[model samples]
Target: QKSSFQTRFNVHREVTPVELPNCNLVKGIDNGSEDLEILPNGLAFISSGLKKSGKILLMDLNEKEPAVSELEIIGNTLDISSFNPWGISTFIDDDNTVYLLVVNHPGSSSTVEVFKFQEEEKSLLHLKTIRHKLLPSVNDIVAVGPEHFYATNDHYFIDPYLKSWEMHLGLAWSFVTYYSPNDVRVVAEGFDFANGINISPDGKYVYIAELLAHKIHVYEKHANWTLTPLRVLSFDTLVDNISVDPVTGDLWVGCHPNGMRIFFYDAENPPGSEVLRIQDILSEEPKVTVVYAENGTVLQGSTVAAVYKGKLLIGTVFHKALYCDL
Candidate 1:
């Protein structure tokens, strides 16, 4: 385990904004679009957790307003009882069959709910659900191979009020783990709230966020699914979901500028969002660029910023999706 997350670059002084149009509000959507996963064929899934029998929002990204709807019909057909959705990741088979691994928390327990996507039919068929003793508080997951995944546990403590107590005390008790069909193991431990996890495009590196610590730890992903410590990157604020640009491999991170100012306030106050760009992740001392940072415009708790076909689409943990053209 590393003692300190050292970054050679001075993140604050070097902060520079990259232009991204304010996201156009998306209607007919519910709260808790916590994270986003984009597939190769032009579709994206938003993991919304608030509603009963949680429905993942499927959107046709090509449209101007992008018609959005719930996957309730599919859920009903599959009889996915009490399926409350959370973080989501996409995996397309070699034969082009699409699969989604969703993190579902039904009250006190968590499970990896799997489903296969049918484009022409426009539905997700329930595939399988994986559970293990280690997945106590699975917060986020990234699919690496068939029946292979890495997940983050945001809290060491379970109960809601106790979980909040740990956060208030600045506890570094959270950790990340890797899972497969026959095996479950803790890949890393001792994190100040491990929140988001993602893998590089080539599967060479894995990135996990330390929310309360305000940093991202990068690891070298091996063929055996083990991770080697590469380096740790620090941020000025609280880091949320990380979306890698499929083309450039740059990391687009959704963030809260001030955790103190944003997290505990009124919903209508509209907390500010700062999108950080970690460019050239493959290079030694990769540079960090500030993409978009502002308040009074976007939603209060923006968490995921995804780029598709040169356009920007951002999701909030509390509101609808937004499209930013150009």
Candidate 2:
């Protein structure tokens, strides 16, 4: 039991500080910037807030000094008051329409919300809300189509009681599911805590982060929406969200160096953040580099890191966001 706690929580793990030359805190993001997606056009969408209330913020990275603006959610179907947004992904259709998919856990219920991006108005048109048994506790998602996605379930069961039992027992009940309008299925199973998920730019492969196990699984995607495991990459830190660079096909991962500090918050000794970049991920010996690291003095509990051009953005679970230069 003690060993399980040590391994799962990474109780004693500490960050070996990595420094970046130019880093600045993003303005107007004090609560949380848990996940973000950057478009090829240099437009970035960030999901912000906590359980009570949350919002989606947008930034144009093309500018010299980008500022974030709240996206107006325009529609009657979704109640904006209880909008608890988590992980997010963007899908651009052949017609050039951008669809934003968000994993929402409102009042302890899991659902995926779809929105159409209105660029001129800087607003999101609520399209649909997807709920299925296969998505009990969705943590993050990778959108393949406007209505199709691959999502990770951080927990197997919705009930906290069973969730505690499963975690303590090392049940590895968490899974990844593929969801569409017509079909829904669990594509990968036996994850300790499946958190982040992303796909290759070519849509030929998928990457999933197992948080508690500190492992990243790579899988080959098939035409039938099935996934075959190809490789598993181990890390010292708890991997959170994955952001793939469209041009280079490299992976940027947000991580928690000390898992206990993240879940059990502390003011004096807060959770540290780490960002890892994996180059040539499909290769036998992928090059892994710690792009950024700190002991929570500036940013705490980073959940996602993404880059566009030479600009890098790091987001935290419930703290301030950081912007850095590459």
Candidate 3:
């Protein structure tokens, strides 16, 4: 029977289209926009083109007609050609300094790159690249400090052959790790393709999505940077990346209703997109709402969705981005 395949990939799922008021496809983005992070002041950092060379895009959501502009990367400490950007997160220090952390998959290995946001110059000053054994296959990260973050490893093995075998056997060996200048450790374990990761505004809780398992696990963050499992939220979709509203702590997630379509791409039968919002997660009954859903006609392979003020931005893995008025 193909039951295992169906369950593992949510192959039989279909989306019930949910309509929004007005939405537009972001211009100048012909490649992938895998992940994005928005600031309180309405500036958003978008990661695009997860191929050999990627770009970091900037958008000012406050403008009437928001458009993405590629952010110039300064400093020769990093090689630009091998910049395969994936997930991104922003950290604001006490002095109101902003730092951008990006997950880069260069060659066959993974590393996290840090940059300083120069708002006036409209450029990102490359800071440093961090690599570790525990973050071998990092898919996403949630920054706690300028150089401190908790990352999710989507696969246990760095080798493609071993990763495929592990996934085929449903080993569920993927996990999350906390990284800092002095301390680094695996904070959680036992996940089937752990993907998106984020932290609560209060700095008291953590959220991690296990894609293959179709579950989002919540953990309590301690003073010493350890996590204690609190609860897990299950979904019928494959969750990709997580974003949180700083004020309300609402979680916005991009998902694939039918994972099979994404994994096995076909132009005629493209993968669908879905965005979910979970509110009051710590409460006994959290509210999970389908904010947007549609087949691949408009946006394909939705990877991350985020909201700034009343506007919502939905991004795709390798297609156009959708900006809507909420």
Candidate 4:
């Protein structure tokens, strides 16, 4: 356990404008596209929707218009009927093979599935599905290395509101999970609505985002896929997904509809406060979405924007993609 504190800072200084043209939009998409992962080959993959149309969208981030030209349908589970794919990860191996980790929604009792991408066909084939007897309602998954993966469960909905949920904080092993290639029999558990999961660049710790609690939990990795609690990082606002810079190990946290800012923290010290919060400088209007560019710059939008290539690709729930900077 660590002391609770609040730290705040101004937005980044050298913000660059992203140039994207309006082309096509994914119709009837919602939940603002929860998680995004960029491949080494420069392709961007996103998981959209909350419950119904739970599918994967692929886009060429290098494109001028940045339209979603490809779509992969992840069929619903047998029990739940419809699967909501929330967390995603792309595995790039030495032989140039690509694998994807698709996690199920917190509302379902489905097993976490992994798919192998067939580049020639541009489609994902179901490779294997791992079922854990102790794990339920898995939310997100991320590759810890080339061989291991981590996942989290969002259990806040079990109790639903904040006041009733606070008592089960440490008691709820209802939040996190980890999978490894070396061993086929181990799983990590105990978290509350652990929505966002990411591995540190150095592979020392696993960071998880708790949606209802508005906190980030860190775990130190052990030899046999076991995790020990390292620290607890909290924020004043709600947080969604978390992405780590593979080069710098800096953590970029995306806030929900409330703060509408991407908070950055140092992986080594785990900042007492947010080192940076993406804010719209020229907008007198209410903030809607904030994204961080590839170069660690903040991209603030009145609607929604994501870091595509070196630019900020902005879009809305119903609008096409646009590019801008602070």
Tens-place lDDT per residue, model 1, 1-326, is 12132211112222234457556677766566778887765688888754344788888787767877776436533446677777889887889877888888877777787888877777778777787878878888998755679999988777878887876665678988899887789999898888888988888999998876888999998988889888998877788888888788889888766564445556655566667779977578789877676663555566778888867777776666667765
Quick one: ranking by lDDT, best first? 2, 3, 1, 4
The window of 10 residues in a row where model 1 has the poorest summed lDDT is 1-10
Q: Write the per-residue lDDT of candidate 2 for residues 1-326, one digit (tens) a residue.
A: 89888988899999989989899999999999999999889999999996525999999999988999999999999999889999999999999999999999887789999999999999999999999999999999999999999999999999878888888888999999999989999999999999999999998999999999999999999989899999999988999999999889999999999899998898988999999999999888999999999998889999999998888899999998999988
Name every residue pair that clashes in candidate 1.
Answer: none
TM-score head-to-head 3 vs 4, winner: 3
Candidate 2 residue runs with Cα over 4 Å from true position: none
What are the models' TM-scores? 0.88, 0.98, 0.98, 0.65
Clashes of each: 0, 0, 0, 9
Error at 110, model 4, angstroms: 2.9
Candidate 1 lDDT at 237 equals 76
Error of 1 at 38 (Å): 1.3
Tally clashes: model 4: 9
- Model 2 C-alpha lDDT versus the unseen true structure: 0.93
TM-score of 2: 0.98
lDDT of 3 by residue, 1-326 (tens): 27877898998898899989999999987788999999989999999998635999999999998978899999998999889999999999999999999999988889999999999988999999999999999899999999999999999999888988888788899999999999999999999999999999999999999998898899999999999999999999999999999999999999989888988899999998999999989888889999999997899999999998788899999888999998
Q: Rate the local accuracy (lDDT) of all candidates.
A: 0.75, 0.93, 0.93, 0.52
